Amino acid sequence: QEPRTLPPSPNWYCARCSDAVPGGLFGFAARTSVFLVRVGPGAGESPGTPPFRVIGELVGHTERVSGFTFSHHPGQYNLCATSSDDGTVKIWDVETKTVVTEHALHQHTISTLHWSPRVKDLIVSGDEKGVVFCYWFNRNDSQHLFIEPRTIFCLTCSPHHEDLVAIGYKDGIVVIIDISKKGEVIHRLRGHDDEIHSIAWCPLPGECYLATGSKDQTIRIWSCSRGRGVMILKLPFLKRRGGGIDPTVKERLWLTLHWPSNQPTQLVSSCFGGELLQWDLTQRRKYTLFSASSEGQNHSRIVFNLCPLQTEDDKQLLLSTSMDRDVKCWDIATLECSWTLPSLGGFAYSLAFSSVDIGSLAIGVGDGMIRVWNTLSIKNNYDVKNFWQGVKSKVTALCWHPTKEGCLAFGTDDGKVGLYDTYSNKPPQISSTYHKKTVYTLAWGPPVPPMSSLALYSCGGEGIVLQHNPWKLSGEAFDINKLIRDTNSIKYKLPVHTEISWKADGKIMALGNEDGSIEIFQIPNLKLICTIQQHHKLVNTISWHHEHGSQPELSYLMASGSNNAVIYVHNLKTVIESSPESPVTITEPYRTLSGHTAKITSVAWSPHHDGRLVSASYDGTAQVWDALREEPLCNFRGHQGRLLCVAWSPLDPDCIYSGADDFCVHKWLTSMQDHSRPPQ
């Protein structure tokens, strides 16, 4: 197929950190980057499927990107400007995705910036102390201005007059200044009594008029001729609609505006709960609600930004960013949602494909919500459902039940273990017993004494593996060390267990330990049959090869990764088949896979090949290996962060999913990669 990126969430509480240009292209600030999305025919998606594609990233800021604005000058729609908490304003060329030039003139946290509609190379930025910089980037010039000693929230250069800029402040003051007269205040618009979130100029000259949106829940339309206020629209109270959100998050209003240049008598605004309104300015406060006819397509939390985009084929679209972590595309003709692009608010810690519902991919995320991505949805490349009830903390482990549809085990960084029924709206069952530290692994396997068809095993960072009864999760959970210690007559303290992996046949359990050893236990009683001494640092990942390969000998292969970069495969046919009455120590690998330059977080065997392994590393790459020939095939470098998880697509042998601490999940193709091995 084609690649996909589930990106980080658009940044919150920024008056302008997203924009679009005609054709067209949408950009949004998200963490320390800007993400670029082709929208319309140029995306080149098949009909009925949403016409968008995530196509690139602007990389180089070292902190939160606070502002983003395209140039809207014909022939230079490829230029844009960003601001960041790193103290810089950068000018970018989106064709190369590189910096053209930049400045560090601001000495206080930048609030926002805007590219002049009228002057080709002028970018105006404003900071939290009230300082404004005019930057004419192509003649290398700047002017500081200082109007009033207050925190700038928003700034909008006039579309009609090259010298006029409207500024909105944290306290509700709005001013229009003349940047040719040292920022002289030409109009002082008094009326709002809280944060100005948005300023839109009437897009026709004469019929100037100006609209301002505020945390005070009013939109005020003002005159420059008279100077005075000519219209106050108060937001309506409306029934909250969509699925029941989480009370345990704080949320006041964000009131942003879009004044369509082709429809001067209409004004679009956000509203409580992220509803969108089309206001009729001919009328006594008439509005029409976006998505009024359809159900559950509206945003469920406040909307921060609205970006008009006219496509090549003349569709009028409007893009919305929200605290709900969705980017939505609105068809202005109908006010219905054309499509939604979901996003991630934390590290992608864990991926797990359901063996029952093919292509159903669960994602464990550091924003406390489980995602289920229906990866094989025919008409939607990003069909993602969220689960929040009973989760709360960072989801560091997931594992679908092997036979029961909808049954998802999960684990958290506060040691919690849970079992979700994703086919219902009921909250998850939670284990009464907690791990002292993060749950790094979950695995289903046969029950062992004293339990007492499949038990759930959870491994915490403190070193304990618990056996849970998936019926009675609130009941007793058993530390398996007692069974281990008794079956094998152990006297010294047991190793700290850092990883658990059951062989596919459910007859053998492997535990990886903090000291690097891997122990091999046999049912029914977890008799130790083998200790593998190969890694010398904490074991992060173990995986047993599947059973449906060409030769049956392959299901005895076990891959493992530790805090060192070298990966090993061991072949446990001999030892397992001999069933020794006292345990064997293995100290030579069956295969050695060298290439990575940092810790290995996750390994997984291709279900479509014999002895084909993918690994995820803290070196920022995923590596595909022919394990049997010790041959590196394909290195994926699309992540910016350190990889935490990897999983082979169940239907396409060429497609793998990977997650990282860059807040991204990438779906990529082994055939489209330029490198065969990791950087040296």
What approach was used to elucidate this structure?
Answer: X-ray
Query: Phi-psi category of 314—alpha, beta or left, where left has phi over 0 and alpha has psi -120 to 50?
Result: left
Per-residue CA distances from 271 to 59, 112, 255, 278, 391 (Å): 33, 22, 6, 11, 28
Find all residues with CB under 8 Å of 110, minimum gap 6, and list them. Answer: 66, 67, 83, 84, 85, 87, 89, 125, 126, 127, 128
CB-based contact 591:577 (threshold 8 Å): no
Q: What is the resolution of this structure in A?
A: 2.0
Where do the structural domains in the chain lie, given as residue ranges? 1-337, 338-680
Q: How distant is the alpha carbon of residue 445 from its chain centre?
A: 31
CB-based contact 26:17 (threshold 8 Å): no
Q: Would you state the structure tokens that stand for residue 206, as one six-digit string?
A: 């004469």
Return the closest-CA partner of residue 210 out of 192, 193, 195, 229. Answer: 229
Q: What is the 3-state secondary structure (H, E, C) of 43-81?
A: HCCCCCCCCEEEEEEECCCCCCEEEEEECCCCCCCCEEE
The torsion angles phi and psi of 511, rounded to 5 degrees, stand at -115, 125
- Which CATH superfamily, name and number, covers 1-337? YVTN repeat-like/Quinoprotein amine dehydrogenase (2.130.10.10)
CA gap 393, 102 in Å, rounded: 39
CA gap 42, 626 in Å, rounded: 37
450 prior amide bond cis, ω within 30: yes
What pairing do the DSSP bridges indicate for beta strands 336-342 and 348-353? unpaired
Q: Would you state the structure tokens that stand for residue 338, as one six-digit string?
A: 């054309």
CA gap 538, 250 in Å, rounded: 39
Within this chain, domains 1-337 and 338-680 share the same CATH topology: yes
So what's the architecture of 338-680 in CATH? 7 Propeller (2.130)
24 prior amide bond cis, ω within 30: yes
